[PDB]
Ligand binder design. Structure first.
Ligand SMILES: O=C(NC1Cc2ccccc2C1)c1nccnc1NC(=O)N1CCCCC1
Ligand code: PRO
Length: 494
């Protein structure tokens, strides 16, 4: 009990989350606010999705690279909308030892300015295009909002991809190709559904022509959260960094650029999605151990149980299924059950005397706790199919919750009702940037219906979904009363 999760996910989501990430050994806290340690179980997930994304961006001819952590004032300030957005959260190095630096230098919050400072040397003619680069690194955004492990941190691990193209068409195609890879990263590895859409003008990346986005939704507190992003930068950074190329007709042109990122926030979204009141729940593709084997003794005798459990370990490891046999003498079976449930292991296999006598074992799924007796010779196949089935169940259950978290409305008088039911709204909107602040202020004012002390009551535009319902001929904007343009998702958010 004391060693389990002692806050229910529905009753105290914030304390449940803290208990889950600590007791599963994902996260350790640190003496600098907003910075957290990724312990091995958390870093293993990152390596899994790193492996997947590398393999896929390789097919698009993107190549990994590594650029400096630091940027000079001269470079950092070249693109005005970019730096106006980041400048209050940029951390500056000013000293080495007790000596002042001759010039202060900034830590990257993102690397457009760093990388594009040298793109002009690499891109001189149409022969040099497309240029396609990625980095796996961390960046620093020194905000003073309340941090949350994985999802809102001052330093975070991510990849940032950056490409440059001879025209708009090719760059935009890559934007949406990357956006579908983020859909796959979340779906095939984290069993998380996302919504693709376009950011409103007030929410797009600074310096972007447009920002496409993958949005996730945390049903338990009614909060949307950006899962990944892929920007068409157009020629906006090419203008400011003078990234020009001579085209086939001997005319100077600006490159058309993209950048796109996805972070360890994805792990936090997975935890909040599938985690339950027993702790972490891992999709098998991001769990080091797919199976834990637990022995049960009453009280060859003890050697007979040990030999049998080791046989099952050999069967799984010979088939490339990593597993652990928990043969620790000092802890009860029920201790071990909780121990590994807490840590999110997908499958427990139990072996006691009655299972040995029947030449079977008990196979227990972490997601729904269903138990079944499997003969020894069918354990390999049953385990294989059950790992597939757990992932499918986690994803389908999550997708039903996401679907159920959207209410389509036509007037603002329906909005507050749905927000306080922890929903997002899909609403007809004129898309005028001026209305975004107005909507944020008024929904925050009317929220006077929240028990979160560190997240805003404001609802903001989340994304204009790529999948649009019909817009009836005279539908008005739900806020301004002007002709509505498209349907947009709004909600409270992280
Ligand atoms: O934005 C993050 N942190 C900042 C916001 C915040 C709030 C409280 C305290 C400190 C900070 C700094 C963030 N933190 C951790 C992991 N991913 C994060 N970001 C993202 O997932 N996205 C989407 C993909 C492109 C980049 C942004
Ligand atoms: O920070 C962002 O959103 C973009 C995409 C990764 C590179 N910079």
């Amino acid at each position: 009990n004391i060693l389990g999760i002692t806050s229910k996910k529905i009753e105290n989501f914030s304390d449940w989350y803290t208990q889950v990430i600590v007791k599963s050994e994902l996260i350790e806290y640190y003496d600098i606010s907003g910075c957290y340690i990724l312990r091995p179980a958390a870093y293993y997930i990152w390596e899994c999705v790193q492996a997947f994304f590398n393999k896929e961006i390789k097919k698009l001819n993107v190549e990994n690279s590594y650029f400096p952590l630091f940027v000079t004032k001269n470079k950092l300030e070249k693109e005005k909308n970019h730096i106006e957005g980041f400048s209050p959260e940029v951390a500056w190095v000013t000293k080495y030892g007790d000596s002042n630096l001759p010039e202060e230098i900034a830590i990257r919050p993102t690397s457009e300015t760093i990388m594009y400072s040298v793109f002009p040397k690499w891109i001189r003619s149409y022969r040099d295009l497309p240029l396609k680069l990625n980095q796996w690194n961390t960046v620093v955004r020194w905000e003073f909002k309340q941090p949350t492990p994985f999802i809102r941190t001052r330093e975070f691990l991510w990849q940032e991809g950056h490409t440059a193209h001879k025209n708009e068409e090719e760059a935009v195609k890559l934007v949406f190709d990357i956006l579908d890879l983020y859909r796959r990263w979340y779906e095939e590895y984290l069993a998380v559904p996302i919504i693709k859409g376009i950011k409103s003008e007030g929410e797009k990346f600074g310096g972007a022509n447009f920002t496409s986005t993958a949005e996730a939704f945390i049903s338990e507190n009614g909060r949307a959260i950006q899962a990944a992003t892929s920007h068409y930068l157009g020629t906006n950074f090419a203008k400011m960094f003078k990234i020009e190329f001579e085209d086939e007709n001997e005319v100077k042109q600006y490159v058309h650029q993209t950048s796109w990122g996805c972070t360890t926030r994805s792990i936090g979204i997975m935890i909040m999605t599938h985690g339950d009141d027993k702790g972490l729940v891992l999709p098998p593709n991001v769990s080091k151990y797919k199976v834990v084997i637990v022995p049960i003794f009453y009280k060859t005798d003890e050697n007979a149980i040990h030999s049998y459990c080791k046989d099952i370990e050999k069967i799984l490891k010979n088939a490339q299924i990593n597993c652990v046999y928990d043969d620790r003498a000092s802890y009860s079976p029920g201790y071990k059950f909780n121990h590994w449930e807490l840590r999110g292991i997908p499958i427990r296999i139990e072996v006691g005397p009655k299972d040995l006598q029947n030449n079977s074992c008990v196979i227990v799924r972490r997601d729904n706790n269903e138990k079944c007796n499997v003969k020894k010779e069918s354990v390999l196949l049953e385990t294989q199919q059950m790992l597939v089935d757990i992932h499918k169940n986690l994803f389908l259950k999550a997708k039903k919750k996401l679907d159920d978290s959207i209410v389509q409305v036509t007037s603002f008088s329906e909005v507050m009702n749905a927000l306080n039911k922890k929903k997002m709204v899909l609403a007809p909107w004129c898309e005028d940037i001026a209305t975004e602040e107005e909507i944020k202020k008024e929904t925050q004012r009317l929220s006077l219906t929240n028990s979160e002390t560190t997240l805003s009551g404001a609802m903001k535009p989340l994304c204009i979904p790529l999948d649009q319902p019909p817009m009836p001929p005279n539908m008005k904007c739900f806020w301004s009363g002007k002709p509505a343009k498209r349907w947009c998702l709004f909600g409270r958010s992280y």
